[PDB]
């Protein structure tokens, strides 16, 4: 779920702002190749104070 | 009676919105959050707070508190 | 003897889920699957 | 005397590296495990600041 | 806005869950029933 450069290592700025370039290597790319990235962030198990995991365990 | 006794017990006790909720996935892009909730049967098992209660109170106060604490992280990122 | 025993450090940056870490009192020597880890401990102790 | 330096700083200072090597060293696994792949993003932007 | 840094969202919502209460009398919680034929309710 990340976006790096390929020439240098500089982590490119988010495509949302404008076109894609590394601040050091200044390589340019097609912004629409990698647009619409999918991010599905979940929460680890056994982190909420339960009421029912008693009967659910 | 004993049934009404346990009813008052579950009443005066406070449920915390965490104790009802399952895993909370947040799909990103915009910004999108989804909260799982268990079936009404187990819901009234532990409880006896009604669905419309969830709806109204959840929406309003959950909204407000989420707003405030995300403003907190924003203001800390400002620092 | 470690690198002779099937565990090799990745010069190319690579890492997987199953693999764990091996360290010689503060030095990354390589990485290993945990069952191999226990077998390495066993053979090393027997050699000792 | 106490002293307090950010880890990304010292990590880039140590080796002439690519930030991709940094990430794949941190969360080399199971590509894009949500927790670590978000926290490392946040740290990386924060040091890029 | 896009300029805002990434946020630890799942933890934020997990806290907000615990940080909202539906029917809480201000300053009470945890009511329990314990065994004398004079039945009484413990309240924290
Ligand atoms: Zn670059």
Q: What residues contact residue E2 under an 8 Å CB cut-off, 6+ apart? A: A14, A16, A17
Among the listed residues D21, B73, E31, the one whose alpha carbon sits nearest the alpha carbon of residue C10: D21
Residues of chain E contacting residue B58, judged by C-beta atoms under 8 Å apart: 20, 22
Interface test with B, best of E1, E22, E28 (most B CBs within 10 A): E22
* Residue B41 touches chain A, beta carbons under 8 Å: no
- Structural resolution in Å: 3.9
d(CA C41, CA C45): 6
Whether the Cβ atoms of residue B21 and residue A48 lie closer than 8 Å to each other? yes
Q: How far is CA B63 from CA B23, B55, B72, E21, in A?
A: 18, 12, 14, 12
Whether the Cβ atoms of residue C28 and residue C15 lie closer than 8 Å to each other? no
SS3 string, chain E, reads CCCCCCCCHHHHHHHHHHCCECCCCCCCCCEEEECCCCCEEEEC
d(CA B53, CA B47): 12
Cα nearest neighbour of E11 on chain D: D35
* φ/ψ of residue E27, rounded to 5: 95, 40
Helix (H) or strand (E) holding A3: none
Inspect the structure and tell me whether chains C and A have 3 or more CB pairs less than 8 Å apart: no
Whether the Cβ atoms of residue B70 and residue E7 lie closer than 8 Å to each other? yes
Neighbouring chains to C with at least 3 Cβ pairs closer than 8 Å? D
């Amino acid at each position: 779920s990340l976006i790096f450069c390929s020439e240098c290592g500089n982590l490119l700025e988010s495509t949302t702002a404008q076109w894609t370039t590394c601040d050091q290597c200044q390589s340019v790319y097609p912004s629409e190749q990698f647009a619409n990235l999918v991010v599905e962030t979940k929460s680890s198990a056994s982190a909420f104070p339960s009421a029912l995991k008693l009967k659910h365990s | 009676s004993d049934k009404r006794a346990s009813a008052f017990c579950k009443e005066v006790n406070k449920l915390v919105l965490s104790e009802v909720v399952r895993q909370v996935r947040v799909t990103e892009k915009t910004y999108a959050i989804r909260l799982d909730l268990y079936s009404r049967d187990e819901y009234q098992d532990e409880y006896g707070v009604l669905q419309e209660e969830i709806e109204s109170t959840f929406s309003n106060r959950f909204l407000k508190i989420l707003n405030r604490i995300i403003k907190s992280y924003l203001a800390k990122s400002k620092q | 003897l470690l690198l002779s025993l099937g565990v090799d450090p990745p010069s190319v940056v690579g890492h997987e889920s199953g693999w764990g870490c091996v360290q010689l009192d503060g030095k990354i020597v390589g990485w290993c699957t945990y069952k191999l880890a226990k077998h390495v401990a066993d053979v090393l102790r027997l050699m000792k | 005397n106490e002293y307090l330096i950010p880890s990304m700083m010292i990590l880039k200072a140590l080796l002439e590296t690519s930030d991709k090597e940094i990430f794949e060293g941190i969360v080399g696994k199971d590509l894009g495990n949500t927790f670590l792949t978000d926290r490392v993003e946040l740290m990386l932007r924060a040091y890029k600041s | 806005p896009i300029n805002t840094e990434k946020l630890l969202m799942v933890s934020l919502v997990e806290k907000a869950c615990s940080e909202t209460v539906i029917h809480e009398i201000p300053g009470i919680t945890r009511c329990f029933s314990k065994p004398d034929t004079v039945p009484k309710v413990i309240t924290e």
